[PDB]
Short mmCIF file of all heavy atoms in Angstrom, two decimals:
data_model
loop_
_atom_site.label_atom_id
_atom_site.label_comp_id
_atom_site.label_asym_id
_atom_site.label_seq_id
_atom_site.Cartn_x
_atom_site.Cartn_y
_atom_site.Cartn_z
N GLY A 191 -5.70 -3.60 32.14
CA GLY A 191 -4.89 -3.07 33.25
C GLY A 191 -5.19 -1.63 33.54
O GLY A 191 -5.22 -1.20 34.70
N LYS A 192 -5.46 -0.86 32.50
CA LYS A 192 -5.78 0.58 32.65
C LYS A 192 -7.13 0.68 33.36
O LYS A 192 -7.30 1.54 34.27
CB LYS A 192 -5.80 1.39 31.39
CG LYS A 192 -4.46 1.58 30.72
CD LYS A 192 -4.46 2.54 29.48
CE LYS A 192 -4.94 1.82 28.23
NZ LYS A 192 -5.33 2.71 27.13
N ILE A 193 -8.12 -0.13 32.99
CA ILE A 193 -9.44 -0.10 33.67
C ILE A 193 -9.18 -0.56 35.10
O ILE A 193 -9.70 0.14 35.99
CB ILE A 193 -10.50 -0.92 32.96
CG1 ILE A 193 -10.69 -0.40 31.53
CG2 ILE A 193 -11.75 -0.91 33.73
CD1 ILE A 193 -11.42 -1.34 30.61
N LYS A 194 -8.47 -1.60 35.36
CA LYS A 194 -8.26 -2.16 36.74
C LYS A 194 -7.62 -1.01 37.60
O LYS A 194 -8.12 -0.76 38.70
CB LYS A 194 -7.37 -3.35 36.71
CG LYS A 194 -7.31 -4.16 38.04
CD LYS A 194 -6.30 -5.22 37.99
CE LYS A 194 -5.94 -5.74 39.43
NZ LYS A 194 -5.61 -7.12 39.45
N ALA A 195 -6.63 -0.34 37.06
CA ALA A 195 -5.93 0.76 37.81
C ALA A 195 -6.94 1.83 38.24
O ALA A 195 -6.84 2.40 39.32
CB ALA A 195 -4.85 1.32 36.98
N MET A 196 -7.92 2.18 37.38
CA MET A 196 -8.80 3.33 37.57
C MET A 196 -10.05 2.95 38.41
O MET A 196 -10.65 3.89 38.98
CB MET A 196 -9.27 3.97 36.22
CG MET A 196 -8.10 4.66 35.54
SD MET A 196 -8.61 5.59 34.06
CE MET A 196 -8.40 4.30 32.77
N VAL A 197 -10.56 1.70 38.40
CA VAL A 197 -11.90 1.39 39.02
C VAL A 197 -11.75 0.32 40.09
O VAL A 197 -12.76 0.13 40.80
CB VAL A 197 -12.95 1.00 38.05
CG1 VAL A 197 -13.00 1.89 36.81
CG2 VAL A 197 -12.83 -0.46 37.62
N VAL A 198 -10.66 -0.40 40.20
CA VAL A 198 -10.41 -1.45 41.20
C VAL A 198 -9.34 -1.03 42.24
O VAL A 198 -9.67 -1.01 43.38
CB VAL A 198 -10.11 -2.81 40.60
CG1 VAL A 198 -9.96 -3.89 41.65
CG2 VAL A 198 -11.20 -3.25 39.55
N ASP A 199 -8.18 -0.58 41.79
CA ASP A 199 -7.04 -0.41 42.68
C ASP A 199 -6.80 1.04 42.98
O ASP A 199 -5.91 1.31 43.89
CB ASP A 199 -5.75 -0.90 41.98
CG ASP A 199 -5.69 -2.38 41.64
OD1 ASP A 199 -6.50 -3.15 42.27
OD2 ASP A 199 -4.88 -2.79 40.82
N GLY A 200 -7.41 1.93 42.24
CA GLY A 200 -7.27 3.39 42.42
C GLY A 200 -5.83 3.90 42.33
O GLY A 200 -5.58 4.96 42.79
N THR A 201 -5.00 3.14 41.56
CA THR A 201 -3.55 3.50 41.31
C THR A 201 -3.40 4.41 40.09
O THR A 201 -2.24 4.74 39.70
CB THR A 201 -2.70 2.24 40.99
OG1 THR A 201 -3.32 1.58 39.94
CG2 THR A 201 -2.60 1.34 42.21
N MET A 202 -4.51 4.81 39.43
CA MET A 202 -4.60 5.84 38.37
C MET A 202 -5.81 6.68 38.60
O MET A 202 -6.87 6.16 38.99
CB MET A 202 -4.67 5.24 36.96
CG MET A 202 -3.43 5.44 36.04
SD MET A 202 -3.48 4.41 34.53
CE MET A 202 -4.81 5.19 33.60
N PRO A 203 -5.73 8.00 38.39
CA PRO A 203 -6.94 8.86 38.53
C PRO A 203 -8.08 8.40 37.59
O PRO A 203 -7.80 8.12 36.44
CB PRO A 203 -6.42 10.24 38.13
CG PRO A 203 -4.91 10.21 38.32
CD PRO A 203 -4.53 8.77 38.01
N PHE A 204 -9.29 8.28 38.11
CA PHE A 204 -10.43 7.96 37.26
C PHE A 204 -10.64 9.01 36.15
O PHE A 204 -10.71 10.19 36.47
CB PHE A 204 -11.74 7.85 38.05
CG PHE A 204 -12.90 7.40 37.19
CD1 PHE A 204 -13.11 6.12 36.88
CD2 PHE A 204 -13.76 8.36 36.67
CE1 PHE A 204 -14.16 5.71 36.05
CE2 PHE A 204 -14.83 7.96 35.85
CZ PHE A 204 -15.04 6.64 35.58
N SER A 205 -10.65 8.55 34.92
CA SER A 205 -10.97 9.36 33.73
C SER A 205 -12.05 8.70 32.88
O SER A 205 -11.72 7.61 32.38
CB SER A 205 -9.73 9.64 32.92
OG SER A 205 -10.09 10.06 31.62
N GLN A 206 -13.22 9.34 32.67
CA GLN A 206 -14.33 8.78 31.91
C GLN A 206 -13.86 8.50 30.48
O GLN A 206 -14.25 7.46 29.87
CB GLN A 206 -15.48 9.71 31.82
CG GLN A 206 -16.78 9.01 31.37
CD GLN A 206 -17.43 8.26 32.46
OE1 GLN A 206 -17.80 8.84 33.47
NE2 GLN A 206 -17.58 6.93 32.32
N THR A 207 -13.21 9.47 29.85
CA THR A 207 -12.61 9.37 28.50
C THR A 207 -11.68 8.16 28.39
O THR A 207 -11.78 7.42 27.44
CB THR A 207 -11.96 10.74 28.25
OG1 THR A 207 -13.12 11.59 28.12
CG2 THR A 207 -11.12 10.83 26.98
N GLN A 208 -10.70 8.05 29.28
CA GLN A 208 -9.67 7.00 29.23
C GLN A 208 -10.28 5.65 29.54
O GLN A 208 -9.84 4.64 28.91
CB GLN A 208 -8.50 7.27 30.17
CG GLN A 208 -7.65 8.45 29.76
CD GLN A 208 -6.69 8.95 30.80
OE1 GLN A 208 -6.24 8.21 31.70
NE2 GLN A 208 -6.42 10.21 30.74
N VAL A 209 -11.22 5.56 30.43
CA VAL A 209 -11.75 4.20 30.78
C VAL A 209 -12.66 3.76 29.61
O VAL A 209 -12.60 2.61 29.29
CB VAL A 209 -12.55 4.20 32.17
CG1 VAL A 209 -13.81 5.05 32.07
CG2 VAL A 209 -12.88 2.82 32.59
N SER A 210 -13.41 4.64 29.06
CA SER A 210 -14.22 4.35 27.86
C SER A 210 -13.33 3.93 26.68
O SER A 210 -13.68 2.96 26.03
CB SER A 210 -15.06 5.54 27.51
OG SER A 210 -15.82 5.37 26.31
N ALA A 211 -12.32 4.69 26.38
CA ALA A 211 -11.33 4.38 25.31
C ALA A 211 -10.80 2.95 25.49
O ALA A 211 -10.73 2.15 24.56
CB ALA A 211 -10.25 5.38 25.19
N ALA A 212 -10.36 2.59 26.72
CA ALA A 212 -9.84 1.20 27.06
C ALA A 212 -10.89 0.15 26.86
O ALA A 212 -10.61 -0.85 26.25
CB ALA A 212 -9.30 1.21 28.46
N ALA A 213 -12.12 0.38 27.36
CA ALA A 213 -13.27 -0.55 27.16
C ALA A 213 -13.53 -0.79 25.68
O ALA A 213 -13.83 -1.89 25.24
CB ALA A 213 -14.48 0.01 27.89
N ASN A 214 -13.49 0.31 24.92
CA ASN A 214 -13.79 0.21 23.44
C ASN A 214 -12.72 -0.62 22.76
O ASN A 214 -13.09 -1.27 21.74
CB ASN A 214 -13.85 1.66 22.84
CG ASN A 214 -15.06 2.42 23.27
OD1 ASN A 214 -16.00 1.80 23.82
ND2 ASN A 214 -15.12 3.66 22.94
N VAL A 215 -11.49 -0.62 23.17
CA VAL A 215 -10.44 -1.50 22.52
C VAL A 215 -10.84 -2.95 22.83
O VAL A 215 -10.78 -3.82 21.83
CB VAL A 215 -9.02 -1.23 23.06
CG1 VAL A 215 -8.02 -2.26 22.64
CG2 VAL A 215 -8.57 0.17 22.65
N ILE A 216 -11.26 -3.28 24.00
CA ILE A 216 -11.57 -4.68 24.40
C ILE A 216 -12.76 -5.14 23.61
O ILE A 216 -12.71 -6.23 23.01
CB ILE A 216 -11.72 -4.77 25.93
CG1 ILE A 216 -10.44 -4.40 26.64
CG2 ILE A 216 -12.27 -6.09 26.39
CD1 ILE A 216 -10.55 -3.81 27.96
N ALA A 217 -13.81 -4.36 23.53
CA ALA A 217 -15.00 -4.69 22.76
C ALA A 217 -14.67 -4.86 21.24
O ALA A 217 -15.14 -5.76 20.58
CB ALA A 217 -16.13 -3.66 22.97
N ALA A 218 -13.87 -3.92 20.74
CA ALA A 218 -13.59 -3.95 19.32
C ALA A 218 -12.84 -5.29 18.99
O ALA A 218 -13.12 -5.96 18.06
CB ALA A 218 -12.83 -2.74 18.86
N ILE A 219 -11.80 -5.52 19.83
CA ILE A 219 -11.02 -6.83 19.55
C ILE A 219 -11.95 -8.05 19.79
O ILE A 219 -11.80 -9.00 19.00
CB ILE A 219 -9.72 -6.82 20.42
CG1 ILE A 219 -8.81 -5.71 19.89
CG2 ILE A 219 -9.04 -8.17 20.39
CD1 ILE A 219 -7.55 -5.51 20.69
N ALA A 220 -12.80 -8.03 20.79
CA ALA A 220 -13.74 -9.13 21.06
C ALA A 220 -14.61 -9.38 19.82
O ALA A 220 -14.86 -10.56 19.53
CB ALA A 220 -14.47 -8.81 22.34
N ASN A 221 -14.98 -8.34 19.09
CA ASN A 221 -15.81 -8.40 17.88
C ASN A 221 -14.97 -8.59 16.59
O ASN A 221 -15.65 -8.56 15.52
CB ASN A 221 -16.71 -7.17 17.76
CG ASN A 221 -17.78 -7.24 18.77
OD1 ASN A 221 -18.64 -8.14 18.71
ND2 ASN A 221 -17.87 -6.36 19.75
N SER A 222 -13.67 -8.77 16.66
CA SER A 222 -12.77 -8.74 15.47
C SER A 222 -12.69 -10.06 14.68
O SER A 222 -11.97 -10.15 13.73
CB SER A 222 -11.38 -8.23 15.81
OG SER A 222 -10.64 -9.09 16.70
N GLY A 223 -13.41 -11.07 15.15
CA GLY A 223 -13.46 -12.38 14.46
C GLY A 223 -12.12 -13.14 14.62
O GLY A 223 -11.57 -13.61 13.55
N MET A 224 -11.62 -13.25 15.86
CA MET A 224 -10.36 -13.89 16.17
C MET A 224 -10.44 -15.42 15.94
O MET A 224 -9.36 -16.09 16.07
CB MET A 224 -10.00 -13.61 17.65
CG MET A 224 -9.68 -12.11 17.91
SD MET A 224 -9.17 -11.81 19.63
CE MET A 224 -7.70 -12.86 19.64
N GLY A 225 -11.61 -15.99 15.68
CA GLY A 225 -11.84 -17.36 15.25
C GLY A 225 -11.11 -17.70 13.99
O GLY A 225 -10.66 -18.83 13.83
N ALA A 226 -10.95 -16.77 13.09
CA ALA A 226 -10.13 -16.93 11.85
C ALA A 226 -8.65 -17.25 12.16
O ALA A 226 -7.95 -17.68 11.29
CB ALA A 226 -10.27 -15.67 11.01
N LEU A 227 -8.18 -17.01 13.37
CA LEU A 227 -6.77 -17.13 13.74
C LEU A 227 -6.52 -18.47 14.42
O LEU A 227 -5.38 -18.77 14.84
CB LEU A 227 -6.32 -16.00 14.72
CG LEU A 227 -6.48 -14.57 14.18
CD1 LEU A 227 -6.11 -13.53 15.16
CD2 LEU A 227 -5.78 -14.43 12.87
N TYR A 228 -7.53 -19.30 14.53
CA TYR A 228 -7.48 -20.59 15.20
C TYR A 228 -7.62 -21.73 14.21
O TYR A 228 -8.68 -21.93 13.60
CB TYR A 228 -8.55 -20.69 16.31
CG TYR A 228 -8.08 -19.97 17.54
CD1 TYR A 228 -8.45 -18.60 17.73
CD2 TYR A 228 -7.33 -20.56 18.50
CE1 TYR A 228 -8.02 -17.87 18.81
CE2 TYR A 228 -6.89 -19.86 19.64
CZ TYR A 228 -7.24 -18.52 19.77
OH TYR A 228 -6.80 -17.86 20.88
N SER A 229 -6.55 -22.46 13.99
CA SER A 229 -6.61 -23.64 13.14
C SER A 229 -5.54 -24.66 13.67
O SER A 229 -4.60 -24.20 14.31
CB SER A 229 -6.46 -23.34 11.69
OG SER A 229 -5.45 -22.45 11.40
N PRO A 230 -5.79 -25.88 13.45
CA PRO A 230 -4.91 -26.91 13.93
C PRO A 230 -3.46 -26.71 13.57
O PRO A 230 -2.55 -27.11 14.29
CB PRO A 230 -5.47 -28.21 13.28
CG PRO A 230 -6.95 -27.93 13.21
CD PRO A 230 -7.00 -26.44 12.77
N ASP A 231 -3.15 -26.16 12.34
CA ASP A 231 -1.76 -25.97 11.88
C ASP A 231 -1.05 -24.85 12.69
O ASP A 231 0.17 -24.64 12.42
CB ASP A 231 -1.65 -25.71 10.42
CG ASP A 231 -2.41 -24.45 9.99
OD1 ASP A 231 -2.93 -23.70 10.87
OD2 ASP A 231 -2.44 -24.25 8.78
N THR A 232 -1.73 -24.19 13.63
CA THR A 232 -1.07 -23.22 14.52
C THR A 232 -0.52 -23.88 15.80
O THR A 232 0.04 -23.14 16.59
CB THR A 232 -1.98 -22.08 14.87
OG1 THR A 232 -3.09 -22.53 15.72
CG2 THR A 232 -2.51 -21.42 13.59
#
Side-chain angles (χ1 to χ4, degrees):
Chain A
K192 289 188 278 165
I193 300 166
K194 193 186 163 150
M196 291 188 269
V197 314
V198 180
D199 295 341
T201 58
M202 249 170 69
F204 183 82
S205 162
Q206 193 81 60
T207 292
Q208 288 167 28
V209 67
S210 176
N214 289 348
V215 170
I216 296 153
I219 294 175
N221 285 297
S222 66
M224 292 183 63
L227 302 178
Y228 282 89
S229 47
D231 61 5
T232 69

